[PDB]
Structure formats: structure tokens, C-alpha cells
Design an enzyme around this catalytic site. Structure first.
Site, PDB file in Angstrom:
ATOM      1  N   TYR A  78       0.813  -1.223   0.000  1.00  0.00           N
ATOM      2  CA  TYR A  78       0.000   0.000   0.000  1.00  0.00           C
ATOM      3  C   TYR A  78       0.839   1.263   0.000  1.00  0.00           C
ATOM      4  O   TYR A  78       1.691   1.465   0.872  1.00  0.00           O
ATOM      5  CB  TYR A  78      -1.000   0.038   1.175  1.00  0.00           C
ATOM      6  CG  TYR A  78      -2.101  -1.002   1.092  1.00  0.00           C
ATOM      7  CD1 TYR A  78      -2.893  -1.293   2.200  1.00  0.00           C
ATOM      8  CD2 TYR A  78      -2.331  -1.735  -0.103  1.00  0.00           C
ATOM      9  CE1 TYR A  78      -3.916  -2.278   2.133  1.00  0.00           C
ATOM     10  CE2 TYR A  78      -3.328  -2.702  -0.188  1.00  0.00           C
ATOM     11  CZ  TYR A  78      -4.127  -2.969   0.934  1.00  0.00           C
ATOM     12  OH  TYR A  78      -5.114  -3.918   0.839  1.00  0.00           O
TER      13      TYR A  78
ATOM     14  N   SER B  78      -6.145 -14.083   1.746  1.00  0.00           N
ATOM     15  CA  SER B  78      -6.931 -13.188   0.916  1.00  0.00           C
ATOM     16  C   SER B  78      -6.843 -13.681  -0.531  1.00  0.00           C
ATOM     17  O   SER B  78      -5.789 -14.105  -1.012  1.00  0.00           O
ATOM     18  CB  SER B  78      -6.423 -11.736   1.078  1.00  0.00           C
ATOM     19  OG  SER B  78      -7.293 -10.802   0.472  1.00  0.00           O
TER      20      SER B  78
HETATM   21  N1  LIG Z   1      -7.108  -8.036   0.196  1.00  0.00           N
HETATM   22  C1  LIG Z   1      -7.373  -7.312  -0.883  1.00  0.00           C
HETATM   23  O1  LIG Z   1      -7.097  -7.719  -2.198  1.00  0.00           O
HETATM   24  C2  LIG Z   1      -8.055  -6.002  -0.728  1.00  0.00           C
HETATM   25  C3  LIG Z   1      -7.955  -5.284   0.441  1.00  0.00           C
HETATM   26  N2  LIG Z   1      -8.526  -4.040   0.549  1.00  0.00           N
HETATM   27  C4  LIG Z   1      -8.632  -3.369   1.879  1.00  0.00           C
HETATM   28  O2  LIG Z   1      -9.981  -3.044   2.180  1.00  0.00           O
HETATM   29  C5  LIG Z   1     -10.150  -1.650   2.389  1.00  0.00           C
HETATM   30  C6  LIG Z   1     -11.528  -1.192   1.894  1.00  0.00           C
HETATM   31  O3  LIG Z   1     -11.761  -1.503   0.544  1.00  0.00           O
HETATM   32  P1  LIG Z   1     -12.074  -0.366  -0.537  1.00  0.00           P
HETATM   33  O4  LIG Z   1     -12.138  -1.019  -1.832  1.00  0.00           O
HETATM   34  O5  LIG Z   1     -11.166   0.807  -0.266  1.00  0.00           O
HETATM   35  O6  LIG Z   1     -13.551   0.049  -0.016  1.00  0.00           O
HETATM   36  P2  LIG Z   1     -14.776   0.653  -0.871  1.00  0.00           P
HETATM   37  O7  LIG Z   1     -15.469  -0.371  -1.682  1.00  0.00           O
HETATM   38  O8  LIG Z   1     -15.656   1.351   0.102  1.00  0.00           O
HETATM   39  O9  LIG Z   1     -14.175   1.770  -1.851  1.00  0.00           O
HETATM   40  C7  LIG Z   1     -13.740   2.944  -1.155  1.00  0.00           C
HETATM   41  C8  LIG Z   1     -13.611   4.098  -2.106  1.00  0.00           C
HETATM   42  O10 LIG Z   1     -14.925   4.520  -2.468  1.00  0.00           O
HETATM   43  C9  LIG Z   1     -15.010   5.928  -2.375  1.00  0.00           C
HETATM   44  N3  LIG Z   1     -15.826   6.271  -1.193  1.00  0.00           N
HETATM   45  C10 LIG Z   1     -15.833   5.666   0.040  1.00  0.00           C
HETATM   46  N4  LIG Z   1     -16.734   6.273   0.836  1.00  0.00           N
HETATM   47  C11 LIG Z   1     -17.297   7.265   0.134  1.00  0.00           C
HETATM   48  C12 LIG Z   1     -18.261   8.187   0.472  1.00  0.00           C
HETATM   49  N5  LIG Z   1     -18.798   8.209   1.688  1.00  0.00           N
HETATM   50  N6  LIG Z   1     -18.637   9.105  -0.470  1.00  0.00           N
HETATM   51  C13 LIG Z   1     -18.074   9.080  -1.725  1.00  0.00           C
HETATM   52  N7  LIG Z   1     -17.104   8.177  -2.072  1.00  0.00           N
HETATM   53  C14 LIG Z   1     -16.735   7.281  -1.139  1.00  0.00           C
HETATM   54  C15 LIG Z   1     -13.569   6.403  -2.254  1.00  0.00           C
HETATM   55  O11 LIG Z   1     -12.983   6.366  -3.527  1.00  0.00           O
HETATM   56  P3  LIG Z   1     -12.612   7.607  -4.450  1.00  0.00           P
HETATM   57  O12 LIG Z   1     -12.914   8.858  -3.630  1.00  0.00           O
HETATM   58  O13 LIG Z   1     -11.199   7.357  -4.860  1.00  0.00           O
HETATM   59  O14 LIG Z   1     -13.428   7.695  -5.718  1.00  0.00           O
HETATM   60  C16 LIG Z   1     -12.879   5.291  -1.505  1.00  0.00           C
HETATM   61  O15 LIG Z   1     -11.502   5.322  -1.781  1.00  0.00           O
HETATM   62  C17 LIG Z   1      -8.941  -1.006   1.731  1.00  0.00           C
HETATM   63  O16 LIG Z   1      -8.587   0.259   2.252  1.00  0.00           O
HETATM   64  C18 LIG Z   1      -7.865  -2.056   1.957  1.00  0.00           C
HETATM   65  O17 LIG Z   1      -7.302  -1.919   3.247  1.00  0.00           O
HETATM   66  C19 LIG Z   1      -8.987  -3.405  -0.552  1.00  0.00           C
HETATM   67  C20 LIG Z   1      -8.943  -3.984  -1.799  1.00  0.00           C
HETATM   68  C21 LIG Z   1      -8.384  -5.340  -2.020  1.00  0.00           C
END
Ligand SMILES: NC(=O)C1=CN([C@@H]2O[C@H](COP(=O)(O)OP(=O)(O)OC[C@H]3O[C@@H](n4cnc5c(N)ncnc54)[C@H](OP(=O)(O)O)[C@@H]3O)[C@@H](O)[C@H]2O)C=CC1
Ligand SMILES: NC(=O)C1=CN([C@@H]2O[C@H](COP(=O)(O)OP(=O)(O)OC[C@H]3O[C@@H](n4cnc5c(N)ncnc54)[C@H](OP(=O)(O)O)[C@@H]3O)[C@@H](O)[C@H]2O)C=CC1
Lengths: 323, 320
Positions: free
Chosen positions: A41, A135
Site C-alpha cells: 500500500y 486473501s
Molecule cells: N485483500 C485485498 O485484495 C483487498 C484489500 N482491501 C482493503 O480493504 C479496504 C476497503 O476496501 P475499498 O475497496 O477501499 O472500499 P470501498 O469499496 O468502500 O471503496 C472505497 C472508495 O470509495 C469511495 N468512497 C468511500 N466512501 C465514500 C463516500 N462516503 N462518499 C463518496 N465516495 C466514497 C472512495 O474512492 P474515491 O474517492 O477514490 O473515488 C474510496 O476510496 C482497503 O482500504 C484495503 O485496506 C482493498 C482492496 C483489495
């Protein structure tokens, strides 16, 4: 009851160190305890930032739990030396003697899994991490792993971190039954489908606007588009937006709010099993908004049925939870 | 290249012993060799009929049977032995070429069941071990346990697979390839739905006696396949058959079977097979002819894919 974990993927990318520290503080102030980071990350910058917060991670004096992950990408394998090297680097960046949860981030299909797990066993014997996680492994790969560990007398994984949201439910069919059998809890990532489930996009944004964010203007954008950016997924979102309007009228929550409440109240995640949602954000306002939704209650049955109708619309083209 | 196995579920039910013997003859006359039966089929009548055909089963003809956990028989060691030995007497043979665990026994630790199979194999009661209706992850557990214990691994998986029922492709097929199991497909016509002989509304008024009405398993079969979106899917394929071939169009039955042999994930190189079903000799002969027909026009193969996407959201589980 379903727990919340803080995702730290954006720390060191969209979120600088101050923003990240405010984020952690907001999360902790709500009574939550667990943080999810990874070797990869922001090229190490996420762990570095978390390690500099003065939280005393991995120490007996610590209420905060930290998870990290080793990956096979960019020619690092998951061969023993690589697993050790990534973990030790993570420990230095987090400025801690051991992590609470260590994941294999994704499968290394070039390295026999018994090799990787023997390395994890040894690293656990050394006290470098408390719990083992997986994962992005298929249900059958999890089973093989668990069965090998039992027969060799090694530490079993106890957590599975996987892709899961209201419109992405492939994990339910085979993975969830497998995890229940082997005793693994499940932490959900992509709970808003990278942001698609906020309703802030239109399908046509990919041709003209291409708004900079998860789906445009970076190295993983195309991966995310291929994962979620599909017409039928936008139809699905519209279906749920209409149901929210019909069920609640003027008092309708945001689709974001609804999508997260689905996770905590209407998914296969169970607090009884220790299951959790990993919240994502690229800003502190997004995080605060999301934390509010986690404290909201269940949805009207019609909206839950709408989300189910929504999933049926996209199930034929669901991205694989495994890699 | 993709092989054919004869399903014998209807032998002793809709098909009496003479019709069954003519069926076996027609099958063997086409160069095929492998027969699929089970302890449970027609309450033991299927095996008994096959055992009386003078084929000398334990030999060019190959025989498979299955032990099951149902009606309070478990898959505890005593039950596995008792079912196999009874099947051996009915089939009038010293060993079967393939012995399956027909479905999982979730009340019995799988290591117990597998130790019984190892012992029974050591005794020469069966040559190969198979699994049916286990999840991919359960297959992996089993194979890993056998390797560690030095026991016989399963080498055949018999699973639900047809042009509109492809859940097995996602996780199971990869697992099988990894552990070296070939795959035999059952319900290749969706119990007869893929013949196009039914209309969705038949469930209200007509309720034609057969796989889907008037018997103890009809409701299971309706729950498995009898869905509106499935009939839409079939109509889409029939329209593509008309479009692609015009007056020369094959039957949807013929098409659905050619899909399996020419356009599915089944590979002759892996020893994969289709298990043909029938409730009469005419059905069987029609089906055997389709197995010898060639590939389909691309547009029909695409139509079959469109059809699958119509029903994928409500696909029945391949595991139990
Ligand atoms: N093991 C793995 O392969 C994985 C692990 N992870 C982990 O899981 C965590 C969460 O997954 P992630 O995919 O980030 O979660 P989400 O599906 O919630 O996507 C989050 C993204 O959506 C947008 N967002 C979130 N909340 C809001 C809101 N309230 N209003 C508007 N836009 C919003 C932002 O993106 P933006 O503003 O950029 O458009 C944010 O970066 C990660 O941080 C990571 O630690 C994540 C992916 C893969
Ligand atoms: N391991 C397991 O759990 C399973 C194993 N099996 C095995 O696989 C074999 C095949 O499975 P099965 O479901 O029977 O295969 P199919 O999907 O092909 O179904 C066969 C049924 O479809 C109808 N049918 C077949 N051919 C025609 C035709 N040409 N014209 C009109 N109708 C036709 C008949 O039903 P109708 O009665 O309506 O005339 C027939 O009984 C079985 O015999 C059995 O040995 C089967 C199921 C489960």
C-alpha cells in the site's frame, strides 16, 4: 455486532500523514480497534505512516490491532525468503515487534503452498505475528491449506479477507461454507464496490468525464473498471435508488448509507463469527460519513429485496473473489 | 474425444429389463463401454437388471456404482461396505471399475468414510474411487487427506453440467485439474428440459408425467430447473437454431448435447465424459445420434452463452 476495520490503502496516496492520523483518530473514537494495511500500500508509505503515529503497535501496551500482508507481485514470490523479507520490512515500517494479523495477500501459483505455509509457521514460532490470514484464495485452496496445516501441526489461518458487497456475492456459495467449516472469520473489502455503490457515477462517465479517483487516472483504475464498471451494475444501482425513494420518500437515506447497512444488517456477515467490514475512504469526510452509516439500523424489507434483485442483475458477470 | 457413459437411473423404473438390455446393446454397438448405476437406483432394480445381462462385469464393459448417506444409512464405514457388497451381489461381479460417494455425509467425518474406501480398495472390491455432489473445497480436503495418509485418491468427479447449468466451471473444474480428476457430466439435458418439449405453464394445467411431474423426485427437479428464465433461455436458443440453419436446423436436444461434446469445458484429453440419460430406447437412440454430430455454428454457441447468462443468477448448486 458485525465489526468494522479501517482500510489504509489510501494513506500515503490521496491521504497525507496528517489526514491519515485524523482518520485513525475518528475511527478509534467510535470504539473500533482494528487497522488493515499491506506491504504494497502506497509503496510502503501506508505502513510507514501508521508506524509513525505513536500507537505502540504490537506492544503489550496497545489497544489497537494491526494487520498486514505479503504479496507475490512484481517478481517477489511467496517463497520463504520473500515472506520473511516482506514481513520484517513491514515490522520496521510499523515500528512494532509483531503484528496481530499477517495475510497472504493473494495466491502465488508458481510456489507450492506448503513452502509458503512452512515459512509462516516458522515466522509465527519466532513471534513475528499472532494470527494468519488468507486473501483472494479460492475456497478449494483455503481447504487444501487448512488440511495441510492440521496434518503438519502448523498454525491454521483464522481470517479470510475477501471481496463482498451488496452487488458482489460470489463468496456466499462456496467460500462462506468452507470458512465456517475450518473456523475462519471473514473480513469484507470493496464494501462500496470501490465507490460505485455511492451512486456518484453514471456509466457514460467512462467516455467523457472520467473523474479522477478509484476508476480513472491511476495504475489500478482499469482493474477496477473491469471489476465493477458494467452497465448492468449501473442498472442495479438505479433499481436500489428507486426502492429507497419508494420505501422512505423524503426520509430516504443515501445509497452509500444503504449499501453499508446491507453489509452490517442483511449480509451473510455475522458478529457471532467475528466477521467484519473493512471500510474504505480517500478522505476524512468520506470516512466520517461511512462511520455514521455503520451506526444506522436495518433497512426496510423492500430495499433489502431491491438489493437482491440488484445482485441478480449482475450475478452473471460477478468478478471472481479469487486470483 | 469427449466420452459417453450410459445412465441407468430409469432401468427398473420406466424401463423394464428387456428395454434396459436393448438400451445397453445400442450403447455398446456404438463403441462405448462405460455404465453408470447406483445402490439407490430403482430401489436396487437398476443394478440387479444390469447384473443379469451376462456381461461378466469383473472385461470390455466398465461398471460404476455409488454408496449414499440417505434414509439414515450414513457413509460410516459399515454402511459404505454394506452398500458396496450389496451392489456387488446385485451386479453379480467381484469388483466394480468405479465406486462413488454419491453425495456428502455431513454427519460423518470424511476421514472415516475415506479410510473405509481405502480398506475396500485394498480388498479389491473396486478399482477407482469417485466423488459426486461434493463442493470443490470438499474435494480438495479429501484429496489432501488421502495424499497425507497414503490412501487412494479419487480420480473421477460426477457432477451436474449442461449448456444452461455451468456453476461447476468456476471453482470445481480448476480444482479437478489440479488434483487430477476427470469429470463426468450428469443432467446433460437438464432432466429433459433442454429437449424443448415443455412450456413453463405446463406446471399449472398439463403436468405431463415424467422427470418433472408425478413422482417422488419431480419437485426436486422442478426446484432445480423449472424456472421461467430457463424457458426464456431455451426459446432464445431455438430462435438461433432457426436463424443459423433455417430449414436444416437440428433439434434443440441435438444442439444441447453437441454443446457438451464440442463447446463445453469437457476435454477428451482429460478423459471427461457425458452421462447420457433416457427413459426409453427411442430417446437413447436419438441421443446417441446427436453424440456423433459435429460442432455448432458460432452464433448458436453464443446463443447458448446468452442463455446461460439469463439463468446464472438462479443456477442450482452442484454440491449438496
Ligand atoms: N485483500 C485485498 O485484495 C483487498 C484489500 N482491501 C482493503 O480493504 C479496504 C476497503 O476496501 P475499498 O475497496 O477501499 O472500499 P470501498 O469499496 O468502500 O471503496 C472505497 C472508495 O470509495 C469511495 N468512497 C468511500 N466512501 C465514500 C463516500 N462516503 N462518499 C463518496 N465516495 C466514497 C472512495 O474512492 P474515491 O474517492 O477514490 O473515488 C474510496 O476510496 C482497503 O482500504 C484495503 O485496506 C482493498 C482492496 C483489495
Ligand atoms: N450423481 C448424481 O447425483 C446423478 C447421477 N445421474 C446419472 O446421470 C445419468 C443421466 O442423467 P439424467 O438427468 O437422466 O440426464 P438428462 O439430463 O439427459 O435427463 C434425461 C431425461 O430427459 C428426458 N429425455 C432424454 N432424452 C430425451 C429425448 N431424446 N427426447 C425427449 N426426452 C428425453 C427423459 O425424461 P422423461 O422421463 O421426461 O421422458 C430422460 O429420463 C442418469 O441416468 C444417472 O445415471 C443422474 C442424476 C444425478
Amino acid at each position: 455486532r458485525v465489526a468494522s476495520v479501517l482500510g489504509t490503502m489510501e494513506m500515503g496516496r490521496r491521504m497525507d500523514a496528517p489526514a491519515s492520523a485524523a482518520a485513525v483518530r475518528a475511527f478509534l473514537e467510535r470504539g473500533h480497534t482494528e487497522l488493515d494495511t499491506a506491504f504494497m500500500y502506497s509503496d510502503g508509505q501506508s505502513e510507514t505512516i501508521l508506524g509513525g503515529l505513536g500507537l505502540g503497535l504490537g506492544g503489550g501496551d496497545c489497544r489497537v490491532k494491526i494487520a498486514t500482508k505479503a504479496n507475490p507481485w512484481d517478481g517477489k514470490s511467496l517463497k520463504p525468503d520473500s515472506v520473511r523479507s516482506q514481513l520484517e520490512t513491514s515490522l520496521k515500517r510499523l515500528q512494532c515487534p509483531q503484528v496481530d494479523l499477517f495475510y497472504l495477500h493473494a495466491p502465488d501459483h508458481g510456489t507450492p503452498v506448503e513452502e509458503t505455509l512452512h515459512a509462516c509457521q516458522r515466522l509465527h514460532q519466532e513471534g513475528k505475528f499472532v494470527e494468519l490470514g488468507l486473501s483472494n484464495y479460492a475456497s478449494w485452496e483455503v481447504a487444501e491449506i487448512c488440511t495441510l496445516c492440521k496434518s503438519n501441526g502448523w498454525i491454521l489461518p483464522t481470517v479470510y479477507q475477501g471481496m463482498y458487497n451488496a452487488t458482489t456475492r460470489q463468496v456466499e456459495t462456496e467460500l462462506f461454507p468452507c470458512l465456517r467449516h475450518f473456523g475462519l472469520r471473514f473480513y469484507a473489502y470493496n464494501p462500496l464496490a470501490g465507490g460505485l455503490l455511492t451512486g456518484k457515477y453514471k456509466y457514460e462517465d467512462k467516455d467523457g468525464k472520467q473523474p479522477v479517483g478509484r476508476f480513472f487516472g491511476n495504475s489500478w483504475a482499469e482493474t477496477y473498471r473491469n471489476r465493477f464498471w458494467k452497465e448492468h451494475h449501473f442498472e442495479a444501482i438505479a433499481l436500489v435508488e428507486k426502492a429507497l425513494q419508494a420505501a422512505y420518500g423524503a426520509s430516504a437515506p443515501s445509497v452509500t448509507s444503504a449499501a453499508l447497512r446491507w453489509m452490517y444488517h442483511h449480509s451473510q456477515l455475522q458478529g457471532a463469527h467475528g466477521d467484519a467490514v473493512i471500510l474504505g475512504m480517500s478522505s476524512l469526510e468520506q470516512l466520517e460519513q461511512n462511520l455514521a452509516a455503520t451506526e444506522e439500523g436495518p433497512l426496510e424489507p423492500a430495499v433489502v429485496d431491491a438489493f437482491n434483485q440488484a445482485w441478480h442483475l449482475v450475478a452473471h458477470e460477478c468478478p471472481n473473489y479469487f486470483r
